Every structure is written in C-alpha cells, then in structure tokens.
Write an enzyme that holds these catalytic residues in place. Structure first.
Site, short mmCIF file in Angstrom:
data_model
loop_
_atom_site.label_atom_id
_atom_site.label_comp_id
_atom_site.label_asym_id
_atom_site.label_seq_id
_atom_site.Cartn_x
_atom_site.Cartn_y
_atom_site.Cartn_z
N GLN A 31 0.89 -1.15 0.07
CA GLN A 31 0.00 -0.05 0.02
C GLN A 31 0.78 1.21 0.03
O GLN A 31 0.45 2.29 -0.79
CB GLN A 31 -0.96 0.00 1.18
CG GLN A 31 -2.24 0.89 1.00
CD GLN A 31 -2.97 1.31 2.22
OE1 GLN A 31 -2.62 0.76 3.46
NE2 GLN A 31 -4.24 1.43 2.08
N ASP A 50 2.31 1.64 -3.74
CA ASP A 50 1.24 1.95 -4.48
C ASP A 50 0.85 3.51 -4.21
O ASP A 50 0.36 3.98 -5.26
CB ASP A 50 0.16 1.00 -4.39
CG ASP A 50 -1.16 1.70 -5.08
OD1 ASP A 50 -1.78 2.60 -4.44
OD2 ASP A 50 -1.64 0.87 -5.82
N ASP A 72 2.93 5.84 -3.16
CA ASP A 72 4.04 6.83 -3.81
C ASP A 72 3.89 6.92 -5.36
O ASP A 72 4.33 7.74 -5.80
CB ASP A 72 5.41 5.93 -3.63
CG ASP A 72 6.62 6.85 -3.82
OD1 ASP A 72 6.90 7.44 -4.92
OD2 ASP A 72 7.48 6.96 -2.96
N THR A 105 3.78 11.77 -8.26
CA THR A 105 5.04 11.41 -9.04
C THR A 105 5.17 9.99 -9.49
O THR A 105 5.20 9.21 -8.52
CB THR A 105 6.30 12.08 -8.47
OG1 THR A 105 6.58 11.46 -7.29
CG2 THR A 105 6.19 13.57 -8.11
N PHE A 128 7.82 8.09 -10.24
CA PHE A 128 8.95 7.77 -9.65
C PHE A 128 8.80 7.33 -8.48
O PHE A 128 7.97 7.89 -7.60
CB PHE A 128 10.16 9.04 -9.70
CG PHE A 128 10.27 9.62 -11.13
CD1 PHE A 128 10.69 8.97 -12.30
CD2 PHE A 128 9.95 10.73 -11.28
CE1 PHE A 128 10.71 9.33 -13.63
CE2 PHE A 128 9.81 11.51 -12.60
CZ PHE A 128 10.20 10.76 -13.67
N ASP A 133 9.95 7.80 -5.41
CA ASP A 133 10.74 8.84 -4.57
C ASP A 133 10.37 9.36 -3.38
O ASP A 133 10.76 10.62 -3.02
CB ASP A 133 10.60 10.07 -5.88
CG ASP A 133 9.24 10.57 -5.98
OD1 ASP A 133 8.21 10.08 -5.49
OD2 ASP A 133 9.12 11.50 -6.91
N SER A 183 7.44 10.62 -2.61
CA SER A 183 6.53 11.66 -2.72
C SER A 183 5.34 11.48 -1.56
O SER A 183 4.64 12.40 -1.36
CB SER A 183 5.85 11.55 -4.13
OG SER A 183 5.07 10.37 -4.54
N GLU A 224 -6.23 6.58 5.93
CA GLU A 224 -7.37 5.61 5.69
C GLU A 224 -7.54 4.33 6.37
O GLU A 224 -8.43 3.87 6.64
CB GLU A 224 -7.23 5.15 3.93
CG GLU A 224 -8.13 4.33 3.56
CD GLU A 224 -7.69 2.89 3.50
OE1 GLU A 224 -6.54 2.37 3.93
OE2 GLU A 224 -8.53 1.84 3.18
N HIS A 274 -5.81 -5.89 -1.94
CA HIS A 274 -7.08 -5.87 -1.57
C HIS A 274 -7.28 -7.22 -0.78
O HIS A 274 -7.96 -7.61 0.16
CB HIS A 274 -8.06 -5.27 -2.28
CG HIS A 274 -7.85 -3.93 -2.56
ND1 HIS A 274 -8.40 -2.96 -3.38
CD2 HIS A 274 -7.02 -2.95 -1.81
CE1 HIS A 274 -8.04 -1.58 -3.34
NE2 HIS A 274 -7.21 -1.60 -2.41
C1 HEM Z 1 -6.98 -2.10 4.54
C2 HEM Z 1 -6.21 -1.60 3.63
C3 HEM Z 1 -6.66 -0.93 2.49
C4 HEM Z 1 -7.95 -0.13 2.22
C5 HEM Z 1 -8.77 0.33 3.24
C6 HEM Z 1 -7.58 0.36 0.87
C7 HEM Z 1 -8.55 1.19 0.25
C8 HEM Z 1 -8.51 1.79 -0.91
C9 HEM Z 1 -9.69 2.55 -1.53
C10 HEM Z 1 -10.86 3.24 -0.86
C11 HEM Z 1 -9.13 2.88 -2.61
C12 HEM Z 1 -9.96 4.01 -3.95
C13 HEM Z 1 -10.70 2.87 -4.59
C14 HEM Z 1 -11.50 3.73 -5.84
O1 HEM Z 1 -12.27 4.50 -5.61
O2 HEM Z 1 -11.15 3.23 -6.91
C15 HEM Z 1 -8.06 1.94 -2.94
C16 HEM Z 1 -7.35 2.45 -4.20
C17 HEM Z 1 -6.03 1.57 -4.44
N1 HEM Z 1 -5.52 0.70 -3.50
FE1 HEM Z 1 -6.18 0.03 -1.71
N2 HEM Z 1 -6.70 -0.52 0.16
C18 HEM Z 1 -6.23 -0.99 0.95
C19 HEM Z 1 -5.01 -1.53 0.81
C20 HEM Z 1 -4.17 -1.77 -0.45
C21 HEM Z 1 -3.01 -2.62 -0.73
C22 HEM Z 1 -2.42 -3.46 0.40
C23 HEM Z 1 -2.66 -2.39 -1.91
C24 HEM Z 1 -1.55 -2.83 -2.58
C25 HEM Z 1 -0.58 -3.80 -2.20
C26 HEM Z 1 -3.62 -1.12 -2.08
C27 HEM Z 1 -3.46 -0.66 -3.53
C28 HEM Z 1 -4.36 0.23 -4.14
C29 HEM Z 1 -4.21 0.99 -5.38
C30 HEM Z 1 -3.03 0.76 -6.32
C31 HEM Z 1 -5.26 1.77 -5.54
C32 HEM Z 1 -5.49 2.61 -6.65
C33 HEM Z 1 -4.97 4.07 -6.29
C34 HEM Z 1 -4.98 5.27 -7.45
O3 HEM Z 1 -4.16 5.07 -8.66
O4 HEM Z 1 -5.80 5.96 -7.45
N3 HEM Z 1 -4.44 -1.09 -1.42
N4 HEM Z 1 -7.59 1.33 -2.20
CA LIG Z 2 6.33 8.80 -6.57
#
Ligand code: HEM
Ligand SMILES: [Ca+2]
Ligand SMILES: *[C@@H]1O[C@H](CO)[C@@H](O[C@@H]2O[C@H](CO)[C@@H](O)[C@H](O)[C@H]2NC(C)=O)[C@H](O)[C@H]1NC(C)=O
Ligand SMILES: *[C@@H]1O[C@H](CO)[C@@H](O)[C@H](O)[C@H]1NC(C)=O
Ligand SMILES: *[C@@H]1O[C@H](CO)[C@@H](O)[C@H](O)[C@H]1NC(C)=O
Ligand SMILES: *[C@@H]1O[C@H](CO)[C@@H](O)[C@H](O)[C@H]1NC(C)=O
Length: 595
Positions: A105, A108, A110, A184, A186, A188, A190, A258, A351
């Site tokens: 998380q 991701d 960053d 960003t 990178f 980095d 951020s 969050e 997730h």
């Molecule tokens: C309890 C833990 C976590 C919660 C409550 C959480 C919650 C969320 C929420 C609410 C979103 C926005 C979803 C949307 O509107 O499309 C999101 C996006 C995201 N989550 Fe999680 N998540 C968690 C854990 C993780 C983990 C462990 C990872 C990766 C290993 C991860 C990767 C992501 C990514 C890549 C996005 C997309 C962000 C973007 O580019 O906008 N999440 N998550």
């Molecule tokens: Ca970054």
C-alpha cells in the site's frame, strides 16, 4: 497526428539541470522530455481506452448498450457471487507477515493516485447522487442487485463519482478521456514529502533551519514524533468518534489516515527523515536547512527503492521476477517512466491480502489489554486509537508478528472491506471495495481480460472449458461465465486476481506481467535511481545496501526485538533478535570536508 498538444492544469517550472536533487513535482527527471513522469498528468495507456461511446462513457452506463453482445454484470453482483466469503478460519498467509500487505500500500501510494472529480463542496449533486441514485455527469452509482441485504438497510445504491481527467475537469474536452495521476510516477518518497510545492513547503519545519519535517505539537509518543494534524473540517477522523475529536494526520499523500496501519507506516518514515537530518547536522555543522532537507530526502527515497526492489518484489513476482526485471544496466533515457492506467488496477491485488482484524501487542508480543484485537472496519480513518490508546509500537509489533491474508480463489476479499468500508465523504460503514474496484475499471476505460492476456503473450480462453483450464478451477470459471458470458468481458481487476499464483509469488501470470513491466520502467527510466552512477558515490552506495526495515523499526520506535527478514512470517521469540545485532546505516560517507 499525435495529440501531445493538450495539457492544461500541470504546474510548469524551469529545470535547473545541474541540480543533484529531484524536483517535488517530478518535472526535469528526463532532460529531453521534462514533464515525463511528473504529477498531475495523464496516466499512460499501454492500450487504447475502451468506453461505451468510444470516448468517455463507461461500459454499463447505458443499459441498452452491450459489450461484445452482452450486458455487463453489476459490479456489486460480481462482488456478492464471486468475491465474498464468511469463514475467516484458514485464510492467513503462512509465509508473509502483515507488513507484506502494508508495504504494498505504501509503494502503491508513492506511485499513483487518480482522485475523484470534485467540483468543490456546497453542491447538491453530492446529495442527488447519494440521496436518489440518479446517474449522470460524474455520478455513476453502484446499484444493488435483487436480494442484496443492503437494499433492506442502506438504500438503492452506493454512491460513486467518476475519476478526474486531464485538460479541463468541468466541461470536458474531446477525443478519449484520460484519467489524472496526481502523484509522481518515480519511486521517490512523494508520499512523505508531497507531489506539489505548496504542500511540500507546508510539511516542512521552516522556523528552525535544521531541514526537519514539522511534527505534532499537541501529542507525543513517549517523546517520539507524531505527524501533524490536518487543518481541515469537516474531518472524517473526528466524525468516527465525536467524543475523542482526534483529527486526521497531515502528510505528503492525502490517503495517509485511510487505515491505522497506513498512518503508522507514515509515522515511521517521518521519524526517519528527522533522525537522518539531525545525524547529518552532526557530521556537517555548516550545511544549511535546505541542504539538510534535500539530503535526508534523497536517502529516504533510496531506502524505499531498495526495500521495494530487493526485499518486496521478489516475493510478489517469485519465479517471474527475472523474466520481467533483469539486472540493472543503467539509466535508459528512452524508457517511458509514467505509470500506466492498467497498473493502478493491477496493483490492487493487495485488497485480497488484507485480513479481517488488527492487533496491538505488548512488549513480550502478547495481547495488549482486553480489546487487543479489533475488527478492521473500526479502523478506517481512525487516528484516536493511536493518540489515545498506546501510540504506534503496539501496532508495529502486530505488523511484525501477525500475518497477511492469502489470496484464495474461494475467499477473495474480507467483509470488513466488502461490506463495511468507510468513505471520507459519506457517513456509513457500508461500502464495498470490490464493487468500487470493478466500477472503477469501467470508469477508467479498461480493456477486458483477454486484451490484457494478449498484451502479455498469454492464451486467450473463449469457452468455459478454456477458462477452467487457465484458472484451474471449475466452479470459479462457471460463476464467471454465468455473469459475464464471454471471458473477453471480464473486468481486469477480477480476471487478474482469479488466476492461480506463480511459483514463490503472490500473483498470477497476467499480473506478474503487468506489474513486472511497470517496475522495470520506473527503475530504468529514472535518472535518480539509486544505482545510477553519479547519484550517490560508491561508498554511499556501499553504506545504503545495508538498510533494512528491521533497522528502521529499531531506530524510530521503542521496540528492542525484531526479526531479520520482516516480510516473511516470523514467530516470537525464536525468530526475533536484539536490535543491537542489526546492521546500522553508516552515514560517514556523507561527511563533507572544506580544505
Ligand atoms: C485496509 C487496507 C486498504 C484499504 C482500506 C484500501 C482502500 C482503497 C480505496 C478506498 C481505494 C480507492 C478505490 C477507488 O475509488 O477506485 C483504493 C485504491 C487503491 N488501492 Fe487500496 N486499500 C487498502 C490496501 C491496499 C493494498 C495492500 C494495496 C496494494 C498492495 C492497495 C493498492 C491500491 C491501489 C493501487 C489503488 C489505486 C490508487 C490510485 O491510483 O488511484 N491497497 N484502496
Ligand atoms: Ca512517487
Ligand atoms: C521546528 O523545529 C524546532 C527546533 O527543533 C522545534 O522546537 C523545539 O521542539 C521541542 C519540542 O516542541 C521543544 O522542547 C523546544 O522548546 C524547541 N526547541 C527550539 C530550539 O525551538 C519546533 O517544534 C519545530 N516545529 C514544528 C512545527 O515541528
Ligand atoms: C518464506 O519465504 C522466504 C523468502 O521468500 C523463503 O526463502 C523461505 O524458504 C520461505 N519459507 C517457507 C517455510 O517456505
Ligand atoms: C471514543 O474515544 C474514547 C476515548 O477518547 C473512548 O473511551 C471511547 O471508547 C470511544 N468511543 C467509540 C464509540 O469509539
Ligand atoms: C532502452 O530502451 C529502449 C526502448 O524501451 C529499448 O529498445 C532499448 O533496448 C534500450 N536501449 C539501451 C541502450 O539499453
């Protein structure tokens, strides 16, 4: 003709070009093409977007209109029939700690953030979407299927707002809708320092000239720093307990509060920046504030890269790691470092790694009090449990000593997230993260599962029996066929996560491909990659390869016993060693003499 013309809200700067430090926005990393990988630009498209009208409307917007001849299934219905389960027994990953989940998380956050369209507050469209489930403009509601218990209890729909997009945000513009990445590209740090100059400056302590980050003035964790509180009301973190009235934390990334373990991780990193800055002052008493900040900043960014590429990726990608990410050969200025739109869904594999409870452990790694183990849903936007209920150490020990959830084809996403997610705009512990993820795939114009299989050079099943063979699961394949009708229509988030895992890894083949290419590119296309000759000296690099997450704990907490390999599953006490056994970061290579 291309269309590299469009690009309106962006923050353009002049490039210093001899600076040894990254900009805050990520501009100027690439000299030939300075905006490449900068924040507030469009996510890259590895494949053309797929919208219902070719330009902007998502599949499932117009009920009459099909995808490849079939209706797309409701996001929430896919969630109910495929993603859900009841029994939490047997679901834990026997060889990944909770930290494995939590590092994912961080990384991701960053790399990518595509915020919701706002238009500001004082609008009745936030009511109209929530209150009446009326689809239109940026409201794209998740409707409940027939027999959903939430119908009885919540309403007809979960509100959902479409993601922001480049050029303008209110009246649109033409061609194909492209979502924004507000951070960003990178790796980095951020997430610690911010991706915008306004925010980055606000996070700093500019009273003293010691290059430090601002810390909380209302509360201390046994004399260790907490992040400052966010200014803003209404605050989602005070809404969850109006008696405690503890606000959300202010950090370089907006999602820091969050959930409680994410805020914990953010606190560790802030602490490390201040530790590094005061150690560097000791060695270089003449360095000004700016120089301390940047120089600490540069170390921290290198730490994230190293942990990520040396410890984390090999245990996600497993035997696929080498195939996608060969050994580093230097900076390649022709590589596109931008985060792709599909990566932002591929990396949501995490997730399925989130378990249903969080624990607070005491100094012998024992349950910390009577309410030691808490359901995850009580901990979204919860800062009071940190400030009022033991600080961060008991949470850090739980990170080390407890396990992540294992992705399982019959038990995909816990109900703590599938039915009881809290969203900052709204008031109820009632959202579905899986359904949001599926709805968001469509919002972003994702091509389907078979397009991405073809992209990665993998087979493209067309029949039930083809899908059975790829998924190695008869029942899952059949539930997918009954909802989607053709595997071409399967949304990428669920398609990718349904494949069995590769040897020694925690994702399947499609995902290993999508993740693997992305990470190769942000390494190779980064002028400030930590191994790139001239970014650090040979002796600085030599010092940096000894970092570990275990050491970071030891230096920035009151925890004295840690494991050596923090991402694997570790039992107390046998796998735990004393902090004095753990290699330190030697900063003597940063000493700067005069004559
Ligand atoms: C309890 C833990 C976590 C919660 C409550 C959480 C919650 C969320 C929420 C609410 C979103 C926005 C979803 C949307 O509107 O499309 C999101 C996006 C995201 N989550 Fe999680 N998540 C968690 C854990 C993780 C983990 C462990 C990872 C990766 C290993 C991860 C990767 C992501 C990514 C890549 C996005 C997309 C962000 C973007 O580019 O906008 N999440 N998550
Ligand atoms: Ca970054
Ligand atoms: C900016 O840094 C200064 C200097 O380190 C901080 O002030 C010190 O902090 C501790 C704890 O509040 C106090 O015991 C001292 O009274 C302060 N020393 C000096 C020399 O002022 C200050 O808190 C920092 N500001 C923020 C917002 O983080
Ligand atoms: C746990 O994972 C580590 C690191 O990937 C590996 O080397 C070790 O053999 C694994 N343990 C078990 C019990 O399989
Ligand atoms: C609110 O926080 C107080 C401590 O500030 C605590 O004693 C109480 O349990 C909390 N209530 C809820 C409902 O979380
Ligand atoms: C750098 O990247 C390009 C484009 O991705 C690739 O074709 C080439 O093999 C690489 N060039 C060098 C000099 O490594």
């Amino acid at each position: 003709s291309w269309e590299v013309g469009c690009g309106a809200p962006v923050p353009l700067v002049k490039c210093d070009e001899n600076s040894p430090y990254r900009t805050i926005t990520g501009d100027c990393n690439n000299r030939r093409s300075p905006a490449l990988g900068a924040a507030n630009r469009a996510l890259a498209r590895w494949l053309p977007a797929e919208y219902e009208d070719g330009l902007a409307l998502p599949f499932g917007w117009t009920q009459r209109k099909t995808r490849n001849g079939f209706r797309v299934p409701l996001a929430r219905e896919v969630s109910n029939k495929i993603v859900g389960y009841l029994d939490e027994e047997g679901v834990l990953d026997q060889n990944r700690s909770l930290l494995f989940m939590q590092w994912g998380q961080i990384v991701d956050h960053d790399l990518d953030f595509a915020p919701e369209t706002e238009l500001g507050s004082n609008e009745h469209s936030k009511t109209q979407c929530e209150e009446y489930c009326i689809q239109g403009d940026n409201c794209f509601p998740i409707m409940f299927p027939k027999n959903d218990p939430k119908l009885k209890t919540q309403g007809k729909c979960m509100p959902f707002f479409r993601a922001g997009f480049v050029c303008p945000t209110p009246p649109y513009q033409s061609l194909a809708r492209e979502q924004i990445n507000a951070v960003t590209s990178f790796l980095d740090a951020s997430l610690v320092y911010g991706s915008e100059p306004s925010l980055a400056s606000r996070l700093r302590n500019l009273s003293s000239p010691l290059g430090l980050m601002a810390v909380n003035q209302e509360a201390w964790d046994h004399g260790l720093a907490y992040l400052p509180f966010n200014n803003k009301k209404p605050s989602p973190c005070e809404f969850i307990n109006t008696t405690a009235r503890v606000p959300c934390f202010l950090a370089g990334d907006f999602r820091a509060s969050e959930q409680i373990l994410l805020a914990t991780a953010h606190t560790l990193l802030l602490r490390e920046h201040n530790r590094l800055a005061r150690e560097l002052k000791k060695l270089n008493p003449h360095w000004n504030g700016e120089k301390l900040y940047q120089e600490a900043r540069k170390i921290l960014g290198a730490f994230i890269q190293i942990i990520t590429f040396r410890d984390y990726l090999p245990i996600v990608l497993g035997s696929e790691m080498q195939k996608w990410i060969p050994p580093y050969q230097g900076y390649n200025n022709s590589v596109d470092p931008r985060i792709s739109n599909v990566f932002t869904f591929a990396f949501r594999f995490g997730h399925m790694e989130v378990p249903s409870t969080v624990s607070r452990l005491d100094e012998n790694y024992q349950p910390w009090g009577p309410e030691a183990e808490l359901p995850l849903h009580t901990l979204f936007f919860n800062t009071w449990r940190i400030i009022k209920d033991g600080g961060i150490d008991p949470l850090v020990r739980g990170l080390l000593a407890k396990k992540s959830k294992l992705m399982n084809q019959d038990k995909m996403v816990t109900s703590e997230l599938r039915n009881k997610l809290f969203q900052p705009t709204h008031k109820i512990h009632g959202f579905d993260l899986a359904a949001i993820n599926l709805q968001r795939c469509r919002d972003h114009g994702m091509p389907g599962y078979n397009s991405w299989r073809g992209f990665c050079g993998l087979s493209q099943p067309k029949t039930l029996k083809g899908l059975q063979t790829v998924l190695k699961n008869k029942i899952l394949a059949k539930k997918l066929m009954d909802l989607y009708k053709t595997p071409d229509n399967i949304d990428i988030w669920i398609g990718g996560n349904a494949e069995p895992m590769v040897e020694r890894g925690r994702v399947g083949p499609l995902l290993a491909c999508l993740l693997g290419r992305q990470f190769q590119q942000i390494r190779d296309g980064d002028r400030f990659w930590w191994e790139n000759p001239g970014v650090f000296t040979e002796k600085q690099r030599d010092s940096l390869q000894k970092v570990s997450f275990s050491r970071l704990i030891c230096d920035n907490t009151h925890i004295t016993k840690v494991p050596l390999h923090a991402f694997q599953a570790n039992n107390y006490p046998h796998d735990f060693v004393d902090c004095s056994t753990v290699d330190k970061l030697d900063l003597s290579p940063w000493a700067s003499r005069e004559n």
